Enzyme design. Sequence first.
Site, PDB file in Angstrom:
ATOM      1  NE  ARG A 176      -1.398 -29.142 -27.332  1.00  0.00           N
ATOM      2  CZ  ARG A 176      -1.230 -30.407 -26.969  1.00  0.00           C
ATOM      3  NH1 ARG A 176      -1.846 -30.887 -25.890  1.00  0.00           N
ATOM      4  NH2 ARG A 176      -0.445 -31.193 -27.688  1.00  0.00           N
ATOM      5  CG  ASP A 180      -2.580 -39.727 -24.343  1.00  0.00           C
ATOM      6  OD1 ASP A 180      -2.470 -38.933 -25.310  1.00  0.00           O
ATOM      7  OD2 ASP A 180      -2.185 -39.418 -23.199  1.00  0.00           O
ATOM      8  CD  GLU A 224      -4.969 -30.624 -24.404  1.00  0.00           C
ATOM      9  OE1 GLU A 224      -5.001 -31.868 -24.235  1.00  0.00           O
ATOM     10  OE2 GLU A 224      -3.935 -29.926 -24.262  1.00  0.00           O
ATOM     11  CE1 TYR A 283      -1.107 -31.928 -21.984  1.00  0.00           C
ATOM     12  CE2 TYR A 283      -3.364 -32.412 -21.366  1.00  0.00           C
ATOM     13  CZ  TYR A 283      -2.389 -32.321 -22.323  1.00  0.00           C
ATOM     14  OH  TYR A 283      -2.684 -32.631 -23.639  1.00  0.00           O
TER      15      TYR A 283
END
Length: 658
Positions: free
Chosen positions: A519, A232, A503, A615
């Site tokens: 989430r 990230d 999320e 994801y």
Amino acid sequence: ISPIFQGGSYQLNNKSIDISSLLLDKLSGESQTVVMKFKADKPNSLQALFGLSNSKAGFKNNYFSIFMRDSGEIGVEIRDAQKGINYLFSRPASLWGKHKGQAVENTLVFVSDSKDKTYTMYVNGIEVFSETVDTFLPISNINGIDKATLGAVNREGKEHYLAKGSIDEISLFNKAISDQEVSTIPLSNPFQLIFQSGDSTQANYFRIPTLYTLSSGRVLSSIDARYGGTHDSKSKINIATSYSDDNGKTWSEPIFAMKFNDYEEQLVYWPRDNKLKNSQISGSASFIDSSIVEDKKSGKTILLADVMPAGIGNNNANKADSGFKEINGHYYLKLKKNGDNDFRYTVRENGVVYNETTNKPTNYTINDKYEVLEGGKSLTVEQYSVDFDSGSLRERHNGKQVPMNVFYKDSLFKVTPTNYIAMTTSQNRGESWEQFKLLPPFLGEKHNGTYLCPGQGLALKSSNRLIFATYTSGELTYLISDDSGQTWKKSSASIPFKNATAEAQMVELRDGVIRTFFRTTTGKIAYMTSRDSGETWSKVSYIDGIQQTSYGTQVSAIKYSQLIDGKEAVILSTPNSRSGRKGGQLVVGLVNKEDDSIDWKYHYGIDLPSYGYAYSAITELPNHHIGVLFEKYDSWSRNELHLSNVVQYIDLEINDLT
């Protein structure tokens, strides 16, 4: 070249098969290629598919093997005690297990090249490793080899790494076949690639997939094109898009929706060793976590993403600063000039850089690309490139000038080092994207930007309202536009979690009724409901029947257009595991019209419970099939960083799920 050995339909049932007589005297020269089509839907923890060994007492470390783990990892061992060589090459998340109720035929190609001193493994048309060595060991030249084996390795007369599976086809060649020749070998893949290493993005890694079916029937996908490994931000990451006009069968060469140019677009093999795998591009601006929606009013496609200035990410972003200054009910982007120890500037209407100490304007302006102009003339900076030539990561000027951007390390004027959200639009359904604009702050001067929930925004069926979910500490913050994204307002919804990565994805259960699935940190997916098109929100409930880890994973969700079992249906996509990001499922729930409760009735296993699934994106294709684009690896595991070609696309029918 013709194979020196070809055999097939071998069943591996925890009992090895001896092919020594057929193969060993055919081996010649120091280069070999193994082509193997195999199934393993119930693998043992660690099993060998193929072995060449010295089976004699005292020579247990003289063998070559092709092995797999029940995590989906593939590898080889190449060992010779007399030569003093013990090679182990592998990559996690390299296999498929099952698809639509049937074992997948994986196609493995291993090339042992004596002249280039290189060992290369391909699985399902994807190169998973390619390693060059100083001292080459031909697999044919291991001292005293006397056994060729399927489904184990014979060491000292005993079967090690016994396999459960089948080898439908195995071929060996006394040649290192070229990359070109490999690409002509027929595959039996259950998936396809949309974004991939070596494509137009030149990113070697991809993360955070999205999918959205447009009203024309075109299916659009966005993704993080990640350059400095899978990390990230802080990193170098752009947002890329691709679309399909044939219900997902073929996809366009990717273009960028948002990009920065302070660093070169480099296809880099990011190191996976423990010493260097946390190497991270630390001087580059980046985008991260995109979301898409289509607007009925204007017909435009709208894409949002987080924006990170140079060297910034979640870890080091200023939490107590929006990066904007309020000057009578309006927010203006703040700027710091080279040399100052405070942010003494703002960007105003038409891009005019204002001095705040004096309330005077300057001779500087910001264009639509967030680039710095002096007297209307473009300023530039020198671009950086990255390399590991010194044995560690270096980020160095590369001689190329690019326009000076306020998000760059080298800029004369620099933005606050915090996170922002940006928006871009397309008027041609993803064939090109406009220059991005920053969204205003929603939680005040002294709160950092909220974090965009990746995936889809929601276009309400009966109005022109657009909603994008975002999250921050203690709440979901829904961003709502009724004017094609020209202006936004927030709708805050408290959640019982501090600093959760909450999320969230939305579905419209019926007209004006929105259910948001998100989430959490509890091990369960949560949900909340609005019955006024996003204005107000219910308390939080939890789904029992689906397990997540303590840290959680993004969940994607759609409202299916067709009745299932005479009921309205929602489909969720998520890992179902309390342990890791694995055991991917689609879960079909039926809505109880009387109370809008949902009974999660069907669970479809996307692949083995032990294989990676992180994801994900799902969409109802124009033909009522389901398209799934997902991370097929454990994106949390620190053992599975920096894997290429793991974001993969599959097509499913409702009948497959039920």
